[PDB]
Design a protein around this ligand. Sequence first.
Ligand SMILES: [Mn+2]
Ligand SMILES: [Mn+2]
Ligand SMILES: [Mn+2]
Ligand SMILES: [Mn+2]
Ligand SMILES: [Mn+2]
Ligand SMILES: [Mn+2]
Lengths: 425, 425
Amino acid sequence: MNKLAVLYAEHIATLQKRTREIIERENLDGVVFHSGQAKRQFLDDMYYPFKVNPQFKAWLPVIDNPHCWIVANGTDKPKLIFYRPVDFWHKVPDEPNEYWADYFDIELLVKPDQVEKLLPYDKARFAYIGEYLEVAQALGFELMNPEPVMNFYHYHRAYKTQYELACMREANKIAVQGHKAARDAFFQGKSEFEIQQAYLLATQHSENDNPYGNIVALNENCAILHYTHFDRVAPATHRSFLIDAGANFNGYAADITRTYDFTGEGEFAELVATMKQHQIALMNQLAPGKLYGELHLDCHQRVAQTLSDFNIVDLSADEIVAKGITSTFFPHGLGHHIGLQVHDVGGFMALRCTRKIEANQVFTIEPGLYFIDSLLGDLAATDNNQHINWDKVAELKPFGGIRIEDNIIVHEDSLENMTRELRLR
Amino acid sequence: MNKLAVLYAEHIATLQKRTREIIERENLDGVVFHSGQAKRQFLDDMYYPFKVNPQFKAWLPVIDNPHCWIVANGTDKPKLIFYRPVDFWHKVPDEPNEYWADYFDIELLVKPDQVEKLLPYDKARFAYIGEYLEVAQALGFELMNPEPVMNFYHYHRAYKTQYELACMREANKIAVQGHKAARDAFFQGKSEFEIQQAYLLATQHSENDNPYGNIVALNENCAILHYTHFDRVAPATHRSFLIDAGANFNGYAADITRTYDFTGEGEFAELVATMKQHQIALMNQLAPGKLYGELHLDCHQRVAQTLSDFNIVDLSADEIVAKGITSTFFPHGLGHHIGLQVHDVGGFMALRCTRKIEANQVFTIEPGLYFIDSLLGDLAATDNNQHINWDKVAELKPFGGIRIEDNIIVHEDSLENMTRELRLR
Ligand SMILES: [Mn+2]
Ligand SMILES: [Mn+2]
Ligand SMILES: [Mn+2]
Ligand SMILES: [Mn+2]
Ligand SMILES: [Mn+2]
Ligand SMILES: [Mn+2]
């Protein structure tokens, strides 16, 4: 028996039920999900790597196949037009024969432009959920990504089926293996580039297989939030390491961050150790009914208590917050839902400090503390310039910043930190 | 002094001259090249990796920056609107300060929608060369990628400036380092995936940095022409290895293939050694004035002579060709131009067996010999089924196929095989 296979049955039942409800509320005959197509590079005969329509992979783990269509109404067996071309050029895989194949009425498609005869005869009442409006209109569809249908599925995406939670445990498990290998590489003095290679090797992921662009930062780079590049030359001296990297499994993402001190001793190393405690205490505050806003406000508080205690700012926690200067050391949000998409969808009628945490949802808790040139300089142009220990700043500035991030499943009865349960210190 | 820098001056002069000629022939005030934009994934806040407009990087080595614009007329100094946003989020690089920066009148762009005021006041007579027609029309442009202008630049792209040839030598040099590391990994019994990782490490290339999707094939996979995947599990037995991989330098590509036998002894290993000889003799036939057609017809001849001598087909070379069955063992073209694009552009008014090889052009010579299921089975359904040693086929089938490919610069006085001159056996 396959645990995933058993959970999948309920997954399908759940999407089926959700489908029945929405087509009735909108008087539709059904919904058609288009996996998408490969995008061709301008004036070239090369293509950008394929990225499946999230709304299509929500149903099954087929994420590397364009020209696939799902037609469903929630009561009848969902139809799956599965693109399987034949030609000596590409390797032809066997016909879908895994556990999920049984849940669909599968029609094979040998050429993309032969899909019209496999779709409903009258497409007018079928909502087209996909990126290719022009192709949909030519086929006869009229309802393009109707907002009410998008909002419905997105809202329910926040509530993960057991199959989804299982998939997400797997993604976290792969990512963790990578974060450890990346960790070891850092302590060996490797370059950002080399560290990235180790992560990919340990997770057996190709760059285009991870859920987002990995951030493998060293020293001052740790202060660059959207740091995309990988230096090929190792730094003369190794001070800090920040790696925000994830993994994929059946279309579900992991999104983990870890910051380290090269020596394990000193101010920065202590700062990290503190942030970790604050980070865990924040994870610990997740519970059904809890307002994300409280968690957020609390994070800024912890940050202020950190800035105060490390003499980075010569003021009391409450006054650091009061004066509103914590945002210069922690400029981003505390967390977000995650699942099929890294920054997952959801929320009443299209992360606000107003929504409540609920069971079966999955979150990331990622408090941070950075020393950003631009953001700091701005703080100097205010009457608060007199309140920070600029000597303490220049001493840490060389370490860039800190961020610790886990993915946690909020069960009705408890919290499951997939990341730390995998033993990622 | 910088050799590249000195060659670049002439590069600019050349593009300038080409620009003057075309705008006069088409009565235009100038030409505007748009580097492009990042494409956002459907319903997500993630983007596909950026791919620069080839027509924009033809001018300078800026290939990772969207929202950049070049406006030129060929007599005045070309203008370069260089996107350089500022914000604590992304790492801000210094203002362009390399050798090529001096050849342009550089305006910095901090936000994509602030480009209108930096472009010509009257855009009507400026041809827009780019992918974003909608954005161009909103800015006021009317002439969208006019065919005569596209054809002109494309035609001249076949003739490489010295700067371009130098760039291409560099790409070949990086790729070779990778092909050797990949080679060693194969002999160590690593998996396709592991071999791919070694190649990337040796070339210091991220997957999205190479010019096309690497083909790292093992055993039977060597017979799959468009083989994209990388098995994570090494084969029980290592028989054959085929790696078609390249590299980039300033936007110019290398495109190299090499096939190996695991033991270095046996039929297949002998077959490879022969193909190499045929491959080199084909490279040797490149010369200004030569018709690609002769080279092509000659390749099929060599293939037939190979099939005949290895008793893969019980017929004489001439009759293998005569009966037209070589195409089942060698189904693709012999070579193509290469440069800014792997399959480079060019040719009289938008690789034909009719065009002639000329000086300063760059080519790939890639004869192959494969054992493809589908293609072979088809040969069985013909009266030629009685002509092939099906016992000899089943013996080689397990090795997949062969392809050897080099990139060669055709100088007016000689041939320069960048690949073999780098010592890639
Ligand atoms: Mn059926
Ligand atoms: Mn993250
Ligand atoms: Mn995150
Ligand atoms: Mn200027
Ligand atoms: Mn190739
Ligand atoms: Mn090629």
